[PDB]
């Protein structure tokens, strides 16, 4: 429900330790939780806004030059001097013209010249820093209710949208029928602001690095500045043409709007149009589940004769979704759904919409369950008029675990150490692989930075070759963790 | 003296008339009458579909998007053959003569 | 070559290989720009709409 059909979602089973589980959820993915009890839920971020921004440094995309005055003087007599050189709107350059009697000075030497031209921006581009307070994630929680026409249902009032901040608290949600659920989240560790500059073009916006935003070659001007005319690095937007040794002239240098839309390759786009809405990054959330009523206990079973009203349809990751409908009397009741096999003894193939329930009306319900990797019977009731639907799920033998190995590794490529916060206190193994991934990813971070798509692959080839020639058992040291991992990182970047 | 342009580029353009056309996962690629109009820019990607998109089959359905490319700044480049290329050279002697 | 009010002298093999949408020179109304893919970009976030 609202997760079924979204690509690259993931499942978590287990509330072990106490009654909690650690999940980290991006804007794209949609994590689904399961337990031995404790009805299933669907979480994902929908929105992340920075509330109150403040400008850091305004740059200058496009300028124009007016009021050109030049001044040139005799050879071996000092330098020129002009009244508008005192002002700092004007841009200036000293250079050498050659002079003689035809230029009316004497001495036949190479004299001085200045040229002034005042600088006027007409297209700004400002970036706005925000601190890791006062920013408001919004996380939506939808249980697998089996409510009618609500599956793949990214719209519509069907779940609970709770808005968490670091100003906020436990932020518990009483999603009705099933009880309350509390999310102890960390809205500071994840996206790592105070290196982010919420850049802004005319009608666009990006999330760029701070230190990248500071040293751009455009003429700039400090953030809090009314009368924005004292541009500081004006030398990189005008060029001084002194073609021969005759006099010189000034020209402005176009628009770097398109020249910066190439510079913003690799920068993830955000939306600063009405509120600074971001759609990037993750949010680690400890989820404890000790007050989840199941909404369907204390109800009796059915008497049978269902009616499948929408065809069984598998999704990605190999889970069917059916839609049945009760016929009869005694309508608030459970559903005798079970998947089993040929020869009809072994119950195999579990559920994801655990305890399906007919919610007191003639409203069709939605059941998701994971069949086995071959032929299977999917039984939707009891002996007077049950539904034995046949099904075959493709492949899924050892291809499933070699698929979730690659997808877990790409979760370790997109996320950093936070991909070890996907389970619930492994302890002896998880809490130490977290730290070893923080030091291997730490000394990997103070290297390979600025290095592109291709050059990570190239350094992977180099370390692979040096490992494949070196001796004293450094082959496994130099291929496994560096010589191959930097090739896989060399493929799985430039998202 | 007589140049004639051989190729003009565009510097700043704009896009108008944005259209799209989506289709179910196992029903092949979409098609638009704007796709073979040469003043529209097109590319085939795919989105994921399901019962919440009114679709069925829970897969990755194809999509197109078309938008009318409209230029508004040009960078034209003229060319000249090596004839009708008229130099001008001055001739002056060292006469003793003021100015 | 000619910009808005400027002019350079470049050689033709550099001029013909500029990644930018071009059009054959001597013509009326354009409507047939050739490599239009170098001055538009198509964004497909989250495998949702583009």
């Amino acid at each position: 429900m609202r997760c079924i059909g979204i690509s690259n979602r993931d499942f978590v089973e287990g509330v072990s330790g106490g009654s909690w589980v650690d999940i980290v959820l991006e804007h794209g993915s949609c994590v689904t939780t399961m337990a031995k009890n404790k009805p299933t839920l669907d979480f994902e971020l929908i929105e992340t806004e920075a509330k109150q921004p403040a400008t850091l440094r305004k740059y200058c995309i496009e300028a124009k030059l007016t009021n050109t005055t030049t001044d040139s003087r005799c050879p071996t007599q000092g330098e020129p001097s002009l009244n508008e050189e005192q002002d700092k709107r004007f841009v200036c350059k000293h250079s050498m013209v050659d002079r003689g009697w035809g230029n009316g000075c004497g001495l036949f030497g190479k004299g001085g010249i200045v040229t002034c031209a005042m600088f006027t921006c007409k297209k700004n581009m400002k970036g706005k820093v925000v601190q890791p307070e006062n920013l408001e994630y919004t996380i939506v929680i939808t249980p697998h209710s089996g409510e009618e026409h609500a599956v793949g249902n990214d719209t519509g009032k069907h779940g609970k949208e709770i808005k968490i901040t670091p100003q906020s608290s436990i932020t518990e949600a009483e999603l009705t029928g099933y009880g309350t659920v509390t999310m102890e989240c960390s809205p500071r560790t994840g996206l790592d602001f105070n290196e982010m500059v919420l850049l802004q073009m005319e009608n666009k916006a990006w999330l760029v690095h701070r230190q990248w935003f500071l040293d751009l070659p455009l003429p700039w001007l400090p953030g809090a500045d009314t009368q924005g005319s004292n541009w500081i690095q004006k030398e990189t937007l005008v060029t001084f043409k002194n073609p021969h040794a005759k006099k010189q002239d000034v020209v402005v240098l176009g628009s770097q709007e398109g020249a910066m839309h190439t510079a913003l390759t690799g920068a993830t786009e955000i939306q600063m149009s009405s509120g600074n809405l971001l759609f990037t990054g993750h949010l680690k959330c400890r989820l404890r589940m000790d007050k989840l009523q199941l909404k369907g206990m204390s109800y009796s079973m059915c008497t049978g004769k269902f009616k499948v009203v929408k065809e069984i349809a598998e999704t990605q990751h190999g889970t069917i979704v059916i839609r049945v409908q009760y016929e009869g009397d005694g309508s608030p009741c459970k559903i005798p759904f079970e998947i089993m096999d040929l020869e009809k003894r072994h119950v195999l193939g579990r559920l994801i919409t655990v305890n399906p329930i007919v919610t007191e009306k003639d409203s069709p319900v939605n059941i998701e369950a994971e069949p086995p990797f071959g032929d299977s019977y999917i039984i939707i009731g009891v002996e007077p008029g049950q539904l034995k639907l046949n099904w075959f799920k493709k492949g899924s033998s050892i291809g499933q675990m070699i698929e979730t190995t690659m997808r877990g590794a790409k979760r370790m490529a997109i996320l950093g150490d936070t991909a070890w916060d996907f389970g619930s206190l492994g302890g002896v193994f998880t809490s130490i692989g977290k730290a070893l991934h923080q030091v291997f990813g730490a000394i990997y971070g103070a290297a390979f930075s600025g290095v592109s798509w291709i050059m990570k692959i190239l350094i992977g080839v180099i370390i692979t070759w040096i490992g494949m020639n070196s001796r004293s058992t450094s082959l496994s040291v130099s291929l496994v963790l560096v010589g191959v991992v930097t090739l896989y990182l060399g493929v799985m970047v430039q998202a | 003296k007589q140049p004639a342009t051989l190729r003009k580029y565009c510097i700043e353009a704009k896009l108008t008339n944005t259209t799209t056309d989506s289709r179910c996962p196992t029903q092949g690629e979409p098609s638009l009458n704007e796709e073979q109009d040469k003043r529209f820019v097109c590319k085939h990607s795919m989105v994921d579909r399901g019962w919440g998109n009114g679709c069925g089959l829970f897969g990755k359905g194809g999509i197109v998007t078309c938008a009318m490319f409209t230029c508004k700044k040009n960078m034209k480049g003229k060319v000249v053959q090596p004839e009708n290329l008229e130099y001008t050279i001055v001739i002056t002697p060292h006469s003793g003569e003021e100015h | 070559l000619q910009m808005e009010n400027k002019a350079w002298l470049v050689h033709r093999q550099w001029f013909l290989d500029l990644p930018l949408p071009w059009l054959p020179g001597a013509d009326t109304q354009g409507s047939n720009w050739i490599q239009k893919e170098t001055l538009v970009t198509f964004k497909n976030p989250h495998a949702k709409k583009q």
Partner: antibody, heavy 127, light 109 residues
């Protein structure tokens, strides 16, 4: 508890511009869309509407492209449509209709329960 | 640019009446957006049936729907004299636009 009401304007001579409103209530207006449906008197409904949102996008209806325009308003929670150069076939009753917008604010896929509640209608007259 | 449901149907109060819409694969043959509206001759209609088979809350448990490829049908089990209304349709096309049915009314006597 969710009501969509309009403002009836009757007599408008052909060639001029007619304007219709939609006073929305019962919900946050910026998160739900707003359609416009025309019914010529006694026959088939017709889809005029451009798909407004919290930002202000539209959709290019081919039969109603360069004769009608549309207008949103955020503060007074109201949608506006402006039909210019109307005729004796552009006189009809005008319905508004509500659909819900995606979680990103990009109303492109509609909801399966589109056109939940409508407005009472504004009949117009020409001479 | 329309759907082609018939002009009018009728039936005795108590029996079933099918109203069917026919359209191309741009809206109905591929997609499941085929909604059903009715209006009584006072004013503005009411959303009466969802995508193919689902219904709003307050719809009297007897309106049903199906779709057989390029054609979706609306049946009314247990007809009464309250349901004399102009039955319409809607479909989200693949272009993004909505189209409507031709117009079907209902009589009971």
């Amino acid at each position: 508890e969710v009501q969509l009401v309009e403002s009836g304007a009757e007599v408008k001579k052909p060639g001029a511009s007619v304007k219709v409103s939609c006073k929305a209530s019962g919900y946050t207006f910026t998160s739900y869309a707003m359609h416009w449906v025309r019914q010529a008197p006694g026959q088939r409904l017709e889809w005029m509407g451009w798909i407004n949102a919290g930002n202000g996008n539209t959709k290019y209806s081919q039969k109603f492209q360069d004769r009608v325009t549309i207008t949103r308003d955020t503060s007074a929670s109201t949608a506006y449509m402006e039909l210019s150069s109307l005729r004796s076939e552009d006189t009809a009753i005008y319905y508004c209709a509500r659909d819900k917008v995606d979680d990103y604010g990009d109303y492109w896929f509609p909801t399966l329960w589109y056109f939940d509640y409508w407005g009472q209608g504004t009949l117009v007259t020409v001479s | 640019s329309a759907l082609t449901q018939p002009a009018s149907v009728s039936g005795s109060p108590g029996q079933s009446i099918t109203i069917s819409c026919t359209g191309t694969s741009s809206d109905v043959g591929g997609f499941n957006y085929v909604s059903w509206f009715q209006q009584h001759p006072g004013k503005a209609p009411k959303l009466m049936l969802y995508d193919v088979t689902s219904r709003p809350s307050g719809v009297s448990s007897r309106f049903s729907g199906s779709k057989s490829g390029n054609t979706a049908s609306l049946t009314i089990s247990g007809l009464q004299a309250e349901d004399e209304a102009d039955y319409y349709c809607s479909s989200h096309t693949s272009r993004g636009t909505w189209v409507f049915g031709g117009g079907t009314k209902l009589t009971v006597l």
